[PDB]
Ligand binder design. Structure first.
Ligand SMILES: Nc1ncnc2c1ncn2[C@@H]1O[C@H](COP(=O)(O)OP(=O)(O)O)[C@@H](O)[C@H]1O
Ligand SMILES: Nc1ncnc2c1ncn2[C@@H]1O[C@H](COP(=O)(O)OP(=O)(O)O)[C@@H](O)[C@H]1O
Ligand SMILES: Nc1ncnc2c1ncn2[C@@H]1O[C@H](COP(=O)(O)OP(=O)(O)O)[C@@H](O)[C@H]1O
Lengths: 52, 370, 370, 370
């Protein structure tokens, strides 16, 4: 307390902070959809030269 | 000038951006412009006073929320300009909006004024050298590597279905109804108000969206569960509170299959798919029923594909092979396919250059968009 | 041209002062006016007929002390003129009011007549060049250096809570009850009268205040400690006698958490904090329950915040971290924050200039309330 | 067993009840439970610990008022039970709770639990032979002759808009905000605190209501009187004091037209009605704009009709004729409609028998909700 001793009513002998106890999606795995892997690299290798 | 093009994937609820070539859209954020409600006092607080992005998600309660794109139609162009600037900002891409061609995305059957004004923005404010607006079905097909298959997607605002047979889009076989995830969230808010848990603030609506995205399932038997008793599973709010949802957790996503609940004569998603298939020829319905690629955000409910197969089998003719495939990252299908398409060599001819826009204008966009 | 501004921090019981850029309020004195009770007879007695400052404390038994600011509302404007002149007198500041800007502090939800008459005083009696009336919660946040927090202060006459998240104040979640230190002192005077001790003199009320500030603590379990007849601790006097307080040293500070003892139906301090947090948004409650900042003089009792934690746990939702951060500078937090606020650069444009007041009038100060 | 059904207008501000067929409600006492605050010492004092209606309106100062129902949702069931028992008591009806059918109104969109518990009280504590729950919109149409219209009621707790056309209600167009007379009185209280007059007791809260009903009006423009800073009309208190108001006898009722003042994003009463009309079918707009019915006590402010007309006129499309039927029985319209409906014989088919509820339960009430 560098500059906080000169004041008359600064309370001490008490803790500053009063805390409490510090204590501590499924549709992708369904059965009616044949889920496909995207794999963009394979699709790019597929559509590599199919011009338009 | 033809650098790595920018694949901007719009969405009425969750925007998706990122450069072409990335296997995952590295920069995704919700599509809402948040601005503070309360009066600022302390000097040195948050600045800008228009929050877009993760800052709008971290300080949800502090700000108001208003969406600029409803049912795939842009309602506020100023907010979308700010959102696109945020896409090019220092927090998402850190690049200039003139050194890259832009690949935008739109839902089909949208009004022509959206396409017009959107390209006006990307060619007047942002001085993009080349823009190419395109659908979403084609992009999900480029992502899955296929060339056929009916693409059905239930995004946040548009639930459409566009069938494609070996790279031949059938424009008149497109069904689009504006009954989507945002409306399911709204119907859920209505049932919660009928429960007691009355969420009404704009920034509080996101909590309803989280509840929908988390504690909601679609029962296979519609009336059997729709008329019986529930179990009232509890849910924890961000307050630290507890909410007993109950019967609304299953009646809220039923809206997607029967829009009579909201009081609107339309069709369910299954009728959208069935009618989109039946509107085509007679020598394609077998290949279309055997190839259904789901996508879109709202096609993630627990017990969704089950009810789709049940409804489709009730509607499709007997002994017809019905298959429903879907990608793994269902939320980033269209963007991945956009990255694939924009990373090709035909994309040099697919776009619309700036000089083309200076010569013709809106007409060139309407011509080269199809 | 401008000089170092003066932070005339008000208070219902203690008025702090000091120039900006300082770290300690060098001139603190009680906010009361003392005038002689008896008759002057001798030649060479005290002169002045009005005594403010340490001189009043030096001659308490000779003066009829009377407070001019009750519950944050100025009741005697002439006495406040004397007090503010004493602030600018040759004993506390030794400067002129025409050469310094003023940072006045007011409690929230005060009547408009206080702001308007304060404007007329500091702009018609004192020819102050610039005045800026600010709140008291924001200043304590400036003093602690934080940006978020629920400032729960308790002055001599007004206890209030203003939840502020990330520098933004919520003017609708501000609770304010007129039950604080002065009223607890009056209630303690009543209990000492019920114990067999008279303190009817107004100058003796200071002795009652000394009893409150020196031998009073907050019991955790109220009635459980009320049933136990304590040791009846003995306290001295500024006379030399001895008073046995007894049970009226723990239930006297219970007025802050139970306004029913004074017969006035209102909320407790814990209910003020909990209701001030519950009246805010949904996504802004864990951070507000965390950053609980205390201020004000009345929050210095023994076991104050411990009972506050217990009561808050009784009202906050289950398993939420609460941090009642009570710094050691709770008495002068608002002044320290006033020094920080006036010592900035934006403060030059935050105030109301004298020319602005001459042009508009009260309207100018009403526009810059926050 | 049935003879002259008992109509009950279970309103959160005042409960209006009488028998069926009565042209006027005979008993309209306020909806609050008055308990004493001061101990009884003298024998022969007032009897009982619960004061309801006429007794809790004369001895108001002695009491502490607890409103049972808030925003059309019951909080303390005990209090509502006591109020209903007061209705069947000797001083009010002298009847038994087993000899008459009961028509108890309810606001729309209330949670299911209110309907369930309300019937549980009327079928368990009271052994009512017949109970029917209605809407507080249809009844106003009955008591006003019309069959097609937009019922815009504003009770003391919940305002809403129900568009009914040719006897058919369009439930999806029902808009409902929970901002009414209570909030206006409470906000008037905050304005008096800003004008220096505090009120914190529950017994003095009705004096705030008294001020509202006797001195509040609505300006046709929000800014033509705002910056004018008009006169301060005095108003006497029940003791003999004096309150001058000025900018609060019009600033407090604008909370209905813009609830942003209370710090809650919602829609104003005009937006409630206009959105309830615009959500209805395209062909039904002109008939709903020409048939607007007012009800509820908050629709009695001075200049309310002119403000409502001008706001709708701003929001309605050009040249559409807007007629707002405003009967003189806005407080008793819903009750008179109840006296009409219960005097018919179709009501016999519309209620629920006791055995119906015993064999079914809550399900029977949700079945006959409309
Ligand atoms: N687990 C989930 N269950 C149900 N809906 C979900 C889930 N996760 C996300 N959603 C929905 O997905 C939507 C996002 O879809 P989106 O990809 O934005 O479509 P678009 O990009 O066409 O707008 C959100 O509106 C949300 O409602
Ligand atoms: N050490 C202490 N312990 C308990 N109460 C105190 C203490 N110091 C001051 N108080 C109370 O606080 C009051 C002063 O609080 P203060 O913060 O000055 O109020 P204000 O700033 O509104 O004048 C005094 O009236 C006294 O009752
Ligand atoms: N003459 C009046 N002018 C303005 N407001 C009134 C008047 N009389 C009553 N009120 C307000 O309207 C309310 C009447 O309650 P009411 O509208 O019947 O509520 P409910 O419909 O729930 O019974 C009162 O509580 C008061 O707030």
């Amino acid at each position: 307390d560098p500059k906080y001793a000169d004041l008359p009513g600064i309370a001490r002998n008490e803790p500053d902070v009063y805390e409490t106890s510090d204590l501590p999606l499924e549709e992708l795995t369904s059965t009616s959809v044949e889920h496909i892997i995207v794999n963009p690299n394979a699709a790019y290798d597929k559509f590599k030269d199919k011009r338009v | 000038i033809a650098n790595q093009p920018v694949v901007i994937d719009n969405g009425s609820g969750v925007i998706k951006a990122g450069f072409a070539g990335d296997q995952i859209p590295k920069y995704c954020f919700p599509n809402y412009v948040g601005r503070p409600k309360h009066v600022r006092v302390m000097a040195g607080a948050l600045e800008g006073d228009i929050f877009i992005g993760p800052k709008a998600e971290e300080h949800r309660g502090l700000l108001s929320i208003r969406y600029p794109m409803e049912h795939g139609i842009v309602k506020d162009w100023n907010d979308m300009e700010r959102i696109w600037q945020y896409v090019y900002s220092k927090d998402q891409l850190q690049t200039f909006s003139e050194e890259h061609p832009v690949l935008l995305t739109e839902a089909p059957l949208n009004p022509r004024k959206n396409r017009e004004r959107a390209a006006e923005v990307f060619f007047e404010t942002f001085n993009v050298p080349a823009l190419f607006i395109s659908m979403q079905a084609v992009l999900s097909l480029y992502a899955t590597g296929r060339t056929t298959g009916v693409v059905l997607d239930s995004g946040d605002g548009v639930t459409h279905a566009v069938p494609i047979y070996e790279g031949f889009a059938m424009p008149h076989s497109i069904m689009r109804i504006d009954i989507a995830g945002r409306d399911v969230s709204r119907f859920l808010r209505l049932y919660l108000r009928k429960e007691g848990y009355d969420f009404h603030s704009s920034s509080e609506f996101e909590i309803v969206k989280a509840i929908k995205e988390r504690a909601c399932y679609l029962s296979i038997n519609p009336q059997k569960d729709e008329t019986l008793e529930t179990e009232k599973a509890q849910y924890y709010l961000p307050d630290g509170s507890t909410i007993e949802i109950g019967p609304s957790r299953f009646r809220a996503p039923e809206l997607l299959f029967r829009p009579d609940l909201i009081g609107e004569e339309s069709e369910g998603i299954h009728e959208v798919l069935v009618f989109a298939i039946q509107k085509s020829d007679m020598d394609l319905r077998r290949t279309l029923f055997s190839n259904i690629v789901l996508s879109g955000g709202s096609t993630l409910f627990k017990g969704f594909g089950d009810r789709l197969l049940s409804e489709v089998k009730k509607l499709a003719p007997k002994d017809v092979k019905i298959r429903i495939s879907a990608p793994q990252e269902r939320l980033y299908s269209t963007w991945i396919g956009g990255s694939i398409l924009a990373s090709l060599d035909t994309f040099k001819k697919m776009w619309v250059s700036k000089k083309e826009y200076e010569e013709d204008g809106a007409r060139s966009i309407h011509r080269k968009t199809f």
